[PDB]
Amino acid sequence: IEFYGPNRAKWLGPYSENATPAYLTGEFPGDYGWDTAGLSADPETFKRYRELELIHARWAMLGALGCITPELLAKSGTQFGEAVWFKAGAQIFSEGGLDYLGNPSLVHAQNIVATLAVQVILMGLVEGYRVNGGPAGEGLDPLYPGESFDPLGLADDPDTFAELKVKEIKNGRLAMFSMFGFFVQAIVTGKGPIQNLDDHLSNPTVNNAFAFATKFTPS
């Protein structure tokens, strides 16, 4: 319970090998000291890796929640068409464009190339202004700004804020691994991941993983 210090929860716990690599000793969230290959020895490259991992973690968390929500919403009391995240990308082609919420009173996007061009414009703008700053105050911090992106004001107390940093990083790692699980389930079985959840909760041991283990057999 001492991540910011030498007594952090190390990568093997009581198999910790307390001779840790000296280029990271606490002082940054998520430092669990698991460097078996050591691709981040250089400090500026290490900083790039911190920024890159933060970006990956936030994007992956957003995608993971986006993979949990719509299927459950369409399973509970709404209808989307194909709420499973495979053909949600092809819902614009099928019959009447991509109707949001499965309702012909919402977005109803007919042409995907318009989404394409506007998306490129907006994403270029937001990513450029993410790197170099811009609106809502010029960006002075590349890792965590501290400017008007926290309209509630939770970043006053420092140690709870650092605990929030560590929770953010751990949640992002879990989100990245879980989205890898989503992608592998997309490959192997190619069905709904929450359909997978229901089917495994209905079938705990008879259809576990290895009925789907003789599919990609070369011959």
Ligand X SMILES: CC1=C[C@H](O)CC(C)(C)[C@H]1/C=C/C(C)=C/C=C/C(C)=C/C=C/C=C(C)/C=C/C=C(C)/C=C/C1=C(C)C[C@H](O)CC1(C)C
Ligand Y SMILES: CC(=C/C=C/C(C)=C/C=C/C=C(C)/C=C/C=C(\C)C=C=C1C(C)(C)C[C@H](O)C[C@@]1(C)O)/C=C/[C@@]12O[C@]1(C)C[C@@H](O)CC2(C)C
User: Residues marked as binding for chlorophyll b?
Assistant: 11-12, 34, 36, 56, 58-59, 89-90, 107, 110-111, 119, 127, 130, 134, 136, 145, 216
Rule CB under 6 A: say whether 129 interacts with ligand CLA: no
In the numeric block, the tokens 């004001």 are attached to 153
For ligand X, give the closer residue by CB, 58 or 207: 58
Direct distance between the N- and C-terminal alpha carbons of the chain, in angstroms, rounded to an integer: 52
Which residues contact ligand Y by CB under 6 A?
1-3, 9
Helix or strand (DSSP H, E) at 64: helix 43-76
Let me know how long the chain is.
Answer: 219
Distance, in Å, from the CA atom of 195 to the CA atom of 108, rounded to the nearest integer, reads 27
Stretch that binds ligand CHL, among 9-17, 49-57, 80-88, 192-200 (CB under 6 A): 49-57
Least separation in angstroms between residue 37's CB and ligand X is: 3
Provide the 3-class DSSP secondary structure of residue 23: coil
Contact residue for ligand X among 10, 56, 130, 191 (CB under 6 A): 56
Rule CB under 6 A: say whether 52 interacts with ligand CLA: yes
Rule CB under 6 A: say whether 34 interacts with ligand CLA: yes
Residue 123 binding: pick among a copy of itself, ligand CHL, ligand X, none (C-beta 5-8 Å cut-off by kind) = ligand CHL
Contact residue for ligand CLA among 8, 20, 31, 71 (CB under 6 A): 31
Rule CB under 6 A: say whether 74 interacts with ligand X: no
Contact residue for ligand X among 3, 176, 192, 194 (CB under 6 A): 176
What is each CA distance from 48 to 53, 106, 118, in whole angstroms?
A: 8, 40, 29
Rule CB under 6 A: say whether 182 interacts with ligand CLA: no
Provide the 3-class DSSP secondary structure of residue 98: strand
HSE-CB at 156 with a 13 A cutoff on CA atoms is 4
Q: Contact, 61 vs 175, CB < 8 A? A: yes
